[PDB]
Design a protein around this ligand. Sequence first.
Ligand SMILES: CCC(=O)Oc1c(C)cccc1C(=O)O
Ligand SMILES: [Ca+2]
Ligand SMILES: [Ca+2]
Ligand SMILES: [Ca+2]
Ligand SMILES: [Zn+2]
Length: 316
Amino acid sequence: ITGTSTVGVGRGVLGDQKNINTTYSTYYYLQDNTRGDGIFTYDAKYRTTLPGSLWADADNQFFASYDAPAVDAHYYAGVTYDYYKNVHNRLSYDGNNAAIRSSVHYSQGYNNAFWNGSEMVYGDGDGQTFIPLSGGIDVVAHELTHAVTDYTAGLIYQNESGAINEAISDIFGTLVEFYANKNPDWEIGEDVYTPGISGDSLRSMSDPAKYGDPDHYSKRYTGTQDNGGVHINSGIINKAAYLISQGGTHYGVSVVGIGRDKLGKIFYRALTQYLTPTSNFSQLRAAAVQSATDLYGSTSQEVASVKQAFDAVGVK
Ligand SMILES: CCC(=O)Oc1c(C)cccc1C(=O)O
Ligand SMILES: [Ca+2]
Ligand SMILES: [Ca+2]
Ligand SMILES: [Ca+2]
Ligand SMILES: [Zn+2]
């Protein structure tokens, strides 16, 4: 809507207070005009029609229970925008400052979040397996990264290209988490997963196996569940990414870590310049090696570490 840019304050899912960019026109709307062509957060009001209504609030204060998932969807999308802009010189998910839209309070007891081709969508969780999913910045950044991927590589969402698609979202969701720097980890979803159990997570990049995901190509899933295992076989790439960044010896293969920033540079380059809708794990390895080579030279440590990492996960 048309209005004047304002700053409101609220409490997120985890009870943390934050300021948020809003727009004033009779009501205060969750519309951030400070980034690209705007960030817009909607109320789906527990139904599944999208996007629902642009979030309207009478006084610019957002401390109601009902407001918290909105506060975080809105804020963490702003942080994710900032990451891609400042760190990769990318303007929004299409690179041309497309409006970023999110809807929260989707459906009832809904344990998922997704990119629907046009916007981000967050369920509130059933309060057992999940709390409102926008409460985790790695979740928000995972979702917005699905938009980035669809506008760039276009990785089809099934089988190996689908596993790569998922891994890219976990990788950048994690790099954004570290970018915001509030107790970052190499785990996925820990902030909104199983409120009753501390210490766990939906996935682990450091040790995928912890939650039944493969950490070696020889262990990949080839059945048909989960689109040919997109959230399962992503463990193999997540592990490889972890290794490139943090190093380690995995099944006897030693990897010298090169750090998170170089990991991000390499995978961002592979994503936007070399992967295609049907890339498989072997072609991602070549893409990662060629990207590292572009960035640091064929005789670099960086290239050598990428190869070590894919060797360690059994991807040639
Ligand atoms: C880290 C965010 C995530 O994985 O969200 C999903 C959930 C919670 C359920 C089903 C699919 C997804 C997804 O984004 O792929
Ligand atoms: Ca209010
Ligand atoms: Ca995390
Ligand atoms: Ca938990
Ligand atoms: Zn995903």
